[PDB]
Symmetry: D2
Subunit: 430 residues, 4 copies
């Protein structure tokens, strides 16, 4: 009857395997969860449904969940985020995958539905990134909410929506805040974007960063990280915000701060890290310098009113996959990347293996807590035990040769914490 998996070219399985083995070598954390729980298989009897850009990095994660005894039905939470060779490998591995690069929004949903029913019945766990899976089931298949033991959210947009469902009595299952995890937000969000964002602008535009004026919307971890990438290349970064604290940070860092109404007149490259709608309007395109490159890193595509463009451009010529050059009714052109969607994961390849492992480590730890200590997590959105947090970083210090110092009893007694024990307070903010 139904399909066992749907990928682009299963003949990409071998090239992706080499890719996977190479990525494994950079994923210290993840490989550590394997050589620690493979025998005890803590996720035995689990049937996980995931919605995460099927990238080479997600395969390493998916095989880490399978090594721990879990069953997995995958999907990518992006039509352009998928990496076909990473998929045509997981499929070959025997894991039913439904994801290719460039699925239509109609395809997108079919792929997610394919991962709701296993052989031993419906799913019992959710691994989400963006919130499509947790909401698609919370509103489209409310009869499965009961057989689902736990939820995991990858990104901020996903965790902001959870907190909403909660405050609106719509959350019927417990979810863990992976994103907000220091070793997650202060690494993947910041450091990750610092290298993947421009990798995306470059591969698609091949533009020279030095000289340009880049406007970044929002100064969050993704903003602080994005802004550091352009500025470090020779660009002049302006920043727009709605948060006093964040706004002061950006200025105290050398960044001019204004509105997009006045900044759209100077910028050559525009980047949205914002979590909400209408960041770059048509009233902004009408003032942008010629060939101005516009992209958005945020999760969903509604930061850039891509509609105004396709409905107000004298013409639109696609240069190549996920790259568009429009001709405005004023002469200027506006190279649009990934049709307004995630730029790093659609024009490039996402965050680097190392950084990606820091987040998946947290994802695997979360899946293990939820599926195993159900009593520890009542319906709501819980953080992950700091202890487990500090654990992710510790698992990666070896691959970087980081040599931690060691307190003595003299100091331990002095400070008051354990020479061997914890001391990382919950107030720290990093």
């Amino acid at each position: 009857d139904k399909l066992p998996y749907k990928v682009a070219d299963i003949g990409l399985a071998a090239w992706g395997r080499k890719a996977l083995d190479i990525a494994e070598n950079e994923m210290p954390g993840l490989m550590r969860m394997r050589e620690m729980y493979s025998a005890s298989k803590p996720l035995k009897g689990a049937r996980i449904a995931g919605c995460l850009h099927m990238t080479v990095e997600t395969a390493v994660l998916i095989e880490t969940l399978v090594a721990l005894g879990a069953e997995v039905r995958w999907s990518s939470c992006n039509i352009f985020s998928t990496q076909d060779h990473a998929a045509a490998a997981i499929a070959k591995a025997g894991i039913p995958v439904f994801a290719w690069k460039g699925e239509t929004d109609e395809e997108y949903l079919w792929c997610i539905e394919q991962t709701l029913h296993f052989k031993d019945g419906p799913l019992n766990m959710i691994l989400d990134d963006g919130g499509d899976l947790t909401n698609l089931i919370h509103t489209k298949h409310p009869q499965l909410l009961s057989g689902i033991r736990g939820i995991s959210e990858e990104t901020t947009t996903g965790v902001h929506n959870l907190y909403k469902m909660m405050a609106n009595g719509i959350l019927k299952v417990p979810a863990i805040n992976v994103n907000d995890s220091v070793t997650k937000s202060k690494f993947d969000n910041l450091y990750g974007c610092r290298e993947s964002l421009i990798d995306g602008i470059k591969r698609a535009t091949d533009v020279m960063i030095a000289g340009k004026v880049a406007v970044v919307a929002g100064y969050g971890d993704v903003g602080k990280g994005c802004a550091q990438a352009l500025r470090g290349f020779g660009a002049r970064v302006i920043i727009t915000e709605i948060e006093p604290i964040n706004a002061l940070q950006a200025a105290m860092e050398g960044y001019e701060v204004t509105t997009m109404d006045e900044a759209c007149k100077e910028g050559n490259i525009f980047v949205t890290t914002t979590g909400c709608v209408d960041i770059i309007l048509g009233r902004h395109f009408e003032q942008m310098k010629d060939d101005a490159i516009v992209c958005n890193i945020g999760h969903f595509d509604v930061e850039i009113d891509v509609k105004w463009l396709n409905e107000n451009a004298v013409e639109k010529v696609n240069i190549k996959p996920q790259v568009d050059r429009y001709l405005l009714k004023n002469g200027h052109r506006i190279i649009l990347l990934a049709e307004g969607r995630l730029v790093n994961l659609g024009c490039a390849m996402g965050h680097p293996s190392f950084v990606m492992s820091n987040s998946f480590t947290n994802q695997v730890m979360a899946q293990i807590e939820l599926w195993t200590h159900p009593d520890k997590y009542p319906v709501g959105v819980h953080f992950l035990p700091k202890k487990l947090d500090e654990a992710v970083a510790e698992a990666h210090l070896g691959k970087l040769n980081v040599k931690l110092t060691k307190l003595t009893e003299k100091q331990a007694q002095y400070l008051g914490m354990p020479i061997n024990g914890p001391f990382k307070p919950d107030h720290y903010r990093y």
Copy 2:
């Protein structure tokens, strides 16, 4: 009988007032508290005794408190931090001041006792910086504990000693952790230091930063700032940490992380941002390069073992106030700045006015809650209302010309916060 105030040279008040007039212009938040709460005098019937480095910046805070209608009796929490003209002006402004640069331990504790009693009776509010004002009373004069309505801690050491006092029911009066306030820890700690450290290093040694090797022990907000400073000058910074996360951060920032035992052989400039004992031992000094520069930026002077030096050095000469060249028994020399005490406030002038206001506005804000919302604060250690937190940054945006954007109804709905209302989640770390 008693003394009205004890200061170095009251004839320094004229030059101070000037320096004070220049700083007011740079401390917007402070001024904004004045042009808002002087008439209503919210701190009325208040008798504040505070321990904080009597500098030009602590004078604008002090006079802002009296404007708000308080009774202030000052004192400095460091024998070298004081800024004479700043104390001369305060003394002349008729405020009871006890403090000068270069006091003996025996004088430093006398100065504190002088600010325990007011005409209308003992104190009832505490503004600390290090925990020495809240401890002296808690252990020496416990009987006044009753009269004390609240506590306000300026620095991480005070706040670390607060959660302890609580963990052993030693704390008999509530206190607000001003340090851990976003607009204080991520600005005064990090930025502040990113400017005032080297100033103290330079002003004392006039040493060339570029090309040296700077060893910074501890990668906190202070360690992240001090490192960058040196690093931005052309130095090669090595970092020593005990926490993996913090350590991972440095390693992800390009810094080389190891132990001091191995790094004491390479460094030229030694900076301690750690908050605990024995960072730089003799076991190190014995391996340091000729004329290595060693200083401490952490609050107290037990980071660097100045004792060993004093009792293991061939000869110790004094080039100028707070600068000492030691002649080790191996011929090598070691320039000690401020004798292991705070180098920025010791050899320099401390953080700049603009960053100091963020902390002082928080300071004033705190007292207004403690003294005015006692119910809201039960014995223990509390955080300052995020709302007022975001209020400080706000108060500084104008001076910087930061042009904040404003959400429309459409957006305000989307996201789910108030176009004009709050949306700053407490999960945020910054």
Copy 3:
């Protein structure tokens, strides 16, 4: 008989043309040269044969040359650097192109042989980048030295070999040192590599640059630029050099200077900007941590002992074009890139359009001088008029929106230069 051009897929013509259309807008200089001399056609009667990586950027150069009234026959100076869609356009446009990515060494030479004869007889002008075209003819077809009016050198290596043939009496025609031109050397060499080096490593390995140790061999313009790129992502850069001034530089910049013998032990990513043989040897390979990535940004592939790896590696697997993973006899694996040859041009797309236009303008400027004012250039190696030089930077100030300032008579008189007249002395080193 003979072939009209030989490209990978002329069915890429369409795609390559859009790519060119986007570039032209980014290469202000080349167009300015077009919109200035396409009517006066200064290159009329000339038959240019160039050996420069046939990429999109060079496409714009060629079409500019032809727009100036010249005949052109092209070939790439690298077996992996070619950009087939850009060559398929130059092909359709009617221009004879003998290039494509991945040619055999035996093919690479045949492709150059095709660009030696035109219908009107042999070439009379040479546009080189590496020294292969000027050498092939000097040593293989000496009977053609008479017909060549001039030479144009793109890179250091080429201009280094030019200065030799001369010192040896082998140079039979005059050449122009393009590389040493300020708006090329300090722009292309430095800024081009600061952006394209990394873009080469990523697309090829997708390695996380933050947290790694990057060993850079050579601190020339290409070195200073690679160091800065890697060091801005969080990598730890160690530099190796044979020159004190350059060495004192890296040093004074925060970099650690040592020898590859010591460095090969700490390095994670190795980059050779040096222009001579044996920069990285097997004696090193056998000390490199696991999976170390080794690439070469110099011009020729003799900096890394590739021959050793092949004849000493237990096994070699090719992950994907220009990416090989080697298994040494100690287990460790070495990820070689581009087979030792140019990493940016072979793994990425070379430098971004903007920076290449500076270089490519100098180029067009040279061919005009040599072919038009031969009397000015007597057998040897010369520099491009300091005046023309400054003109390359001035034709770009507009696109960047740079607002130069203008002296007044009072000033112009003061200094002693022309308020409109030149002043940039040749002592200047930038």
Copy 4:
């Protein structure tokens, strides 16, 4: 009769010497010129007259000159650049010094005159910095030119006024362009200001760099360093220039380049590195933000129209030595530093010892060339031999733990250079 020297307070000897002892440790170059030429005493018979900011680092140059057999008479090329303890040491040493911080415009000249005649007769050698000494004699005492064997210029201004005198046949004695020495311009000019400018501002204003708008006029080596300094402190930096190449440079560095006319309205800190007059005019003062900080780093005081303020300001209050707060008619205040003269040497200590040794090694090298190999130096202005240049640097590598690499026969043969020999071509600009 005449005076043996003139200092502010000879009692300052003791401490100066301590500072001189320490500085010697940071000047690996000057000491090397000692342990090498003190016995052979090459400057025997020389009566050197030199105008250079009499500072601790100068006293070291001076003492090196005497150790090499040269007689000496000194004066400061600045009214506020002198360091009284470093002059009270040279005086006690027995050397005739005529300098002291804060000398009226008339004392400045009388000091230079004192150093025009030695017992054995007039001067036969000049070591200048600015061109004061060399001009005063050329125009006031032309009768000494015959007895003067050579000239040494420390800075750009003077060197620019030498090529000038030459171009006007008014230069009657051979001079050496020391400034343009790579290990001088790309170190003293660049890395020197990077630390000296902000130290001057800081000590003077103690203002906060972070979050301010800084305008640097002139993007030369001095502009490159000051720009980078302010920038790494968290300040936004606007750059003004008249040169297209230097201009593109700033822009490809991310700096916004405009004109003071537009800029003056934004900046908070104004720094002049230009070499000419009328940089910051009254027309600019009337638009500046309140309490803006203005200062010049160039050599002489005519970049900032100080005369205008003095004659258009409501009132001018002196904050303290070399610091003034002016009151314009619009209520705004202008904090003027050093009265418009060098800000790094007038309010700070100048460049750190280490860097001042590279410059001073060249200084002592030139005198040994002019005063020992005259036939080699005809009337005009020459560059110090490249061989000697590379020596300066090479002589500082050890102190910084730099570990240069050595070429092999295999490579030297390759390149064509001497494994042990030189190769630093003069086409290199560094």
